[PDB]
Write a protein that binds this ligand. Structure first.
Ligand SMILES: *[C@@H]1O[C@H](CO)[C@@H](O[C@@H]2O[C@H](CO)[C@@H](O[C@@H]3O[C@H](CO)[C@@H](O)[C@H](O[C@H]4O[C@H](CO)[C@@H](O)[C@H](O)[C@@H]4O)[C@@H]3O)[C@H](O)[C@H]2NC(C)=O)[C@H](O)[C@H]1NC(C)=O
Ligand SMILES: *[C@@H]1O[C@H](CO)[C@@H](O[C@@H]2O[C@H](CO)[C@@H](O[C@@H]3O[C@H](CO)[C@@H](O)[C@H](O[C@H]4O[C@H](CO)[C@@H](O)[C@H](O)[C@@H]4O)[C@@H]3O)[C@H](O)[C@H]2NC(C)=O)[C@H](O)[C@H]1NC(C)=O
Ligand SMILES: *[C@@H]1O[C@H](CO)[C@@H](O[C@@H]2O[C@H](CO)[C@@H](O)[C@H](O)[C@H]2NC(C)=O)[C@H](O)[C@H]1NC(C)=O
Ligand SMILES: *[C@@H]1O[C@H](CO)[C@@H](O[C@@H]2O[C@H](CO)[C@@H](O)[C@H](O)[C@H]2NC(C)=O)[C@H](O)[C@H]1NC(C)=O
Ligand SMILES: O=c1ccn([C@@H]2O[C@H](COP(=O)(O)OP(=O)(O)O)[C@@H](O)[C@H]2O)c(=O)[nH]1
Ligand SMILES: O=c1ccn([C@@H]2O[C@H](COP(=O)(O)OP(=O)(O)O)[C@@H](O)[C@H]2O)c(=O)[nH]1
Ligand SMILES: [Mn+2]
Ligand SMILES: [Mn+2]
Lengths: 686, 686
């Protein structure tokens, strides 16, 4: 009967004190010796490395104890388990602010807590009965599969082609049941489209609950078939008291792992994390009575919608199901969100500044703590990257309307002509636009090119809105002390790198105090006017990459593969970061959230960092980049083919090609315009 | 105990037979004479005009009976009401597929169905007890306030300024209660920010439930205060059995009506339509224990987030709460969505073609029926326009990735150079891009300018992707029969108009068989190359307005009002439809969904139609338009000031200024580029 408003203590959790968590060591209790070794090892490992965890049990909001899946047959009796629970050091009489975790790996018929009294503690497991499920208080979590193993993406088939060999498939063994079976057998016999339905397992059926469809064979024997199926069928148990079973969750897990779109029969099912996720975007839920209309309904859906559901299912699996770390973090995030506390800030890249011998306005940070966790609930949980981290800024922050600045919210706004507009004279005196005053920061790599560096740095003398320059010394040896660095009116900071890697230009250096970053090589030539216009455009397009150099990708029909092209073209799909603007948000994503395989390959092949960044941004936004000017050059074969390989490998990772074509570029409004002599152009060469 | 899967009959509702509805006439039953006259009249009126309703009770899925709020004191006894229910003609033994409606207008203490047995019927009312609430089966609806009255927007205060006189306010009269009262009184005494809390009503308190906060005074006496408050406080009843009360719903209604952001104390409350709407985006829900942290939490939020919540609350109120028609449509939409049936198609503007004396590829329609109702649940219900209508196309339809066309989904795609790319030679041979082959349609107004029409029409001879031309004869008298219309290789269709109005260029004429529309005046000069490039850009930006002529809006500090400007400028905020591309979707929205006041003013002032369209599109997308070329002209004072008035009035309607500035235009990639002689430019003058 408990709900979060009456069996949880909020006095231990001020909004401002963080979210400390205490984990009981189960080796110090009777549970440990009977726990499944893999579950225990994985949980201990992930809990050791998590950031919210602490050892000071006096300050913790939340106490975590893993009773887990125990070795079969179960030895402990419910009374013994209950006695152990109430004997815990901090199980104050009723056991408030405790969460009990029971992860399922091997047995789908184990229910430890059915006869146990948990007091006011919360329960997290993959199986439930209505008598023991308390919505809004308890949690439904995915089973632990990849214990001590890597959910590598290499085995996953591509998201394309859309249709596969089989429309839908099923494999199970056990008054709507008979009608369902007859309908599906008829569909198979009709051979309008191929299907494969089996109601008897040749491999000895796995143990199951009394009225549940049993799994056939091993995990691999099921995946080898799901890989060929467009839709995956999931029939819920006939028992009305069975809210959710580990078997159905296992089927859902397996289906999402290989891109088969779940189709669920039964509206009364509680899916994992359902109070946070919109499973309608990733799965189809159909009532059993409508079973006779499923074939037509599936045939009706278009390729684009199905592909979108497959993509979203991939995201959900990779983010909440793949690993034990993900599951534990998700549990903590759910509990934190319910009690309305913000997430932990993400880590910066603290750096060592190399000394050398020769107003800045900083952007305010962390202004939307509550809003992201609560108001942006849907975007936070159902859109990439996810809810686990808190960022100082985001490019998706809402922008005030025009009347706001003139009516009370004008802090930092610099209107053109005081709100009256104007030509270049008024245009160049103020940024204008839809967001407040802002600056940008420059980031430049260097490797064995010392003198050109000094000249290029000198070329930056006089930029209006420059905050500072960050030089990334990517060479093994320190710069010579005879080297006299110039002065350009703003600080120049040199940061040392552990080792040479192109991934160091996208690190979130602590020295960067601006949302915007101008990624520029040490040998590139750019005029002041170009940079100003690019900065303004970025201020209008914070979520995009805004850069001068352009490229495009092409199809190779003979080999059914992609290519990297650099010719002059009427359409583009990439903008290299050798000269480009982007938000620091993507630096965090690249460094920490993006898959490690891409970074490792970039280290291996010292090329291909910009391509990865374009892949990332197009994946997040689904919008192409922006090109700003007519210039194409700003001054080998292996370097060329390495990039073909890079593109193909990145596609293999993401599962699809996220790049998008654009057939236009952006120039100033009054560009090449015959003005009257009462007006002046915004720029002279733009 | 009923749920939709066991006390509802799906055999009456094939997915393909529509959603017929039968309404019982309550004048033919004992309810009618005791019903509140206003409720009865409004419900009968709206049910008469609705589209799903039918008179053939044999085919209906759903039978609707209004028991409504009865005159006080209630005369009927529960047994009498129950006997009348079971005596209904189509109340087959258990009364399945029936929904019972009880709208509250005047009394917040009336509960008719507490002692009644409704069988398998669903119940829609604003009050519930846990013993009689069946989640997923019953419905919680808003009270009926604006009965026989217009919810005109003129009385609503502006969304800006953000902060108002009072941070939050409360007015009510009646163990967390005492702590809440003490905390709020302390906050008022601390005068960090102004507030106004009253726990005793000077006006005689309205009757209420045993443990509910009573309303003070009349409706207007509360609005006159809410208009001055940034946040509106809502304290839930102390009775755990009381799920939702008409009083709390009334407070929520009043708060949303005037832009005060609700703040709700208590997580156990069921808000109206909560299973469909994300109230977190419009209201703050805080547990009572956290009452001591509310002041700080409110002070923490930023202006932009608060303004966004206010805007979303405005949308929700206007779309689901304002009128009885909205409530009835919402009820039907909820029930239809639950049983997974698509909505009714929206109506076209059937037109009469005027005859006259002198390959087209049509876009397929209605391809996402199921997807919109189910998969796009969140966007459909929480984003404008809403779920009530079904559109043949939308600009928000997902687009396939690049590899899809080459791997099985290539139907209609025309890659540039067969996927290898290329310069102008390959560029002009195929549309390319990210979406399939497509055409466009031209729409041209005419009024007493016959000859210029013929010349301009002749200028269209030879356009590549033109489907047809639609001429809107906006003159009172028919064209002369001596007039010989030219031939341009495609049909020319002349449609008669009931009366002269600029709103006729945005009507969804049945003759238009393309998503794209080129709105062009009869006296404008445009070159073929320009139109082609604009069409390509629109293909990349289907959700925007893409046009050549540009304008911008300006602030008038002395008068604190807006202005319409047409000078040469470095930044823009509007693109006139005298030459522009847009999606037919917005034509439907303009004609039918957009407020009538704007259309009436456009009829009154024969100017100002384009401004309204820009307002609409920027409101929907929150993104500015696009300008395509350097040209500014394509060849009085009252015409000028009329537009100032139009802008100010439209702002008054929407409650805010939705226009956004853009500081750039788009040109072709290879524009003004020094190519080598192995390449050719995409266009010659673009
Ligand atoms: C400018 O445009 C031209 C014309 O498109 C372009 O030349 C093209 O380059 C590509 C890439 O080298 C050529 O296609 C390759 O041809 C070789 C055989 O000659 C194949 O081995 C290649 O396939 C390999 O790589 C694939 C991955 O990229 C693998 O999947 C595959 O299994 C092979 O390992 C690939 O087919 C193409 O033939 C030429 N075209 C012409 C007309 O020469 C040029 O590169 C562009 N840029 C510049 C700067 O010129
Ligand atoms: C090009 O730019 C120039 C310079 O901005 C611009 O001229 C400006 O026009 C506006 C509009 O006429 C002027 O502002 C008005 O001034 C009159 C008094 O002269 C006021 O009455 C106006 O206010 C009325 O209208 C408001 C709504 O628009 C109401 O809220 C108010 O209560 C009044 O009823 C308004 O302030 C402005 O003074 C001039 N500026 C100059 C320097 O002349 C011109 O229109 C632009 N376009 C073209 C084609 O030239
Ligand atoms: C939003 O959250 C961030 C991070 O949790 C808060 O920033 C921290 O604030 C504490 C207390 O002021 C400092 O001791 C830390 O050093 C800050 N961390 C960083 C990375 O700056 C921030 O104060 C919160 N803002 C609110 C609640 O308005
Ligand atoms: C999607 O819904 C639309 C509208 O409800 C369907 O279009 C109607 O289809 C029926 C039967 O084929 C025709 O009699 C009507 O004339 C159609 N209306 C219009 C406006 O074209 C469409 O068939 C549905 N598509 C599906 C279910 O795939
Ligand atoms: O092993 C390397 C090679 C290059 N770079 C940096 O990568 C950028 C691009 O180098 P380069 O101009 O030589 O490549 P290109 O632009 O000529 O293709 C420069 O900032 C180099 O300092 C680096 O850090 N390590
Ligand atoms: O009472 C009117 C005035 C104009 N128009 C139409 O509106 C467009 C714009 O008219 P006009 O070119 O005269 O306005 P301008 O472009 O000169 O400002 C043309 O298609 C006219 O036929 C109309 O239908 N009714
Ligand atoms: Mn270089
Ligand atoms: Mn004209």
């Amino acid at each position: 009967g408990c709900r979060l408003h009456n069996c949880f203590d909020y006095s231990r959790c001020p909004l401002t004190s963080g979210f400390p968590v205490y984990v009981y060591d189960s080796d110090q209790f009777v549970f440990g010796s009977y726990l499944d070794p893999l579950v225990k090892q994985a949980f201990q490992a992930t809990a050791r490395a998590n950031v919210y965890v602490t050892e000071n049990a006096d300050i913790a909001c939340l106490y975590v104890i893993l009773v887990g899946e125990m070795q079969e047959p179960v030895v402990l009796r419910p009374a013994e388990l209950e006695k152990q629970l109430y004997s815990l050091p901090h199980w104050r009489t009723d056991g408030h602010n405790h969460v009990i975790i029971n992860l399922s790996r091997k047995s789908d018929t184990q229910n430890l807590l059915y006869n146990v009294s948990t007091g006011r503690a919360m329960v997290a497991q993959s199986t439930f009965y209505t008598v023991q499920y308390r919505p809004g208080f308890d949690l439904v979590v995915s089973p632990l599969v990849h214990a001590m193993s890597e959910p590598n993406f290499m085995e996953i088939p591509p998201q394309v082609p859309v249709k596969r060999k089989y429309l839908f498939t099923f494999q199970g063994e056990k008054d709507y049941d008979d009608r369902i079976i007859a309908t599906l057998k008829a569909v198979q016999d009709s051979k309008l489209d191929q299907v494969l339905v089996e109601f008897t397992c040749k491999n000895q059926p796995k143990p199951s609950l009394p009225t549940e469809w049993a799994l056939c064979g091993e995990r691999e024997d099921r995946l080898e078939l799901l890989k060929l199926s467009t839709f995956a069928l999931i029939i819920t148990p006939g028992d009305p008291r069975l809210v959710i079973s580990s078997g159905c969750a296992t089927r859902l897990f397996e289906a999402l792992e290989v891109g088969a779109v779940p189709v669920v029969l039964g509206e009364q099912v509680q899916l994992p994390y359902q109070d946070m996720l919109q499973w309608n975007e990733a799965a189809l839920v159909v009532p059993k009575p409508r079973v006779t209309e499923v074939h037509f309904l599936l045939r009706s859906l278009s390729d684009s919608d199905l592909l979108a559901m497959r993509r979203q299912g991939r995201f959900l699996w990779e983010t909440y199901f793949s690993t034990a770390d993900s599951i534990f973090n998700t549990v903590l995030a759910m509990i934190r969100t319910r009690i309305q506390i913000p997430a932990a800030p993400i880590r910066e890249e603290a750096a060592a500044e190399i000394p050398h011998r020769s107003p800045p306005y900083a952007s305010p940070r962390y202004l939307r703590n509550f809003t992201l966790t609560v108001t942006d609930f849907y975007r936070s949980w159902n859109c990439a990257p996810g809810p686990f981290h808190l960022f100082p800024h985001t490019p998706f922050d809402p922008v005030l309307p025009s009347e706001a600045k003139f009516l009370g919210s004008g802090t930092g706004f610099r209107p053109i002509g005081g709100g009256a507009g104007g030509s270049g004279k008024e245009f160049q005196a103020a940024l204008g636009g839809n967001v407040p005053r802002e600056q940008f920061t420059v980031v430049m790599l260097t490797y064995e090119r010392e003198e050109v560096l000094m000249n290029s740095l000198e070329r930056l003398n006089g930029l209006p809105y420059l905050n500072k320059v960050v030089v990334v010394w990517n060479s093994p040896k320190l710069p010579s002390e005879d080297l006299l660095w110039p002065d350009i009116g703003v600080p120049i900071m040199v940061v040392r790198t552990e080792k040479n890697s192109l991934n160091n230009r996208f690190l979130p250096w602590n020295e960067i105090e601006t949302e915007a970053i101008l990624s520029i090589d040490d040998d590139a030539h750019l005029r002041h006017d170009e940079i100003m216009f690019g900065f303004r455009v970025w201020r209008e397009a914070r979520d995009r990459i805004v850069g001068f150099p352009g490229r495009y990708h092409a199809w190779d029909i003979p080999h059914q593969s992609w290519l990297y092209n650099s010719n002059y073209s009427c359409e583009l799909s990439m903008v290299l970061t050798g000269a480009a603007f982007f938000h620091k948000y993507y630096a965090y994503l690249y460094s920490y959230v993006m898959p490690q395989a891409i970074r490792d390959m970039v280290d291996e092949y010292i090329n291909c960092e910009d391509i990865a960044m374009n892949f990332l941004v197009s994946h997040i936004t689904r919008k192409p980049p922006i090109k700003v000017t007519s210039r194409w050059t700003f001054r080998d074969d292996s370097h060329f083919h390495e990039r073909h390989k890079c593109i193909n490998f990145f596609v293999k990772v993401y599962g699809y090609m996220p790049l998008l074509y654009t057939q236009f570029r952006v120039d100033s409004v009054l560009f090449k315009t015959r003005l009257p002599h009462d007006k002046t152009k915004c720029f002279k060469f733009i």
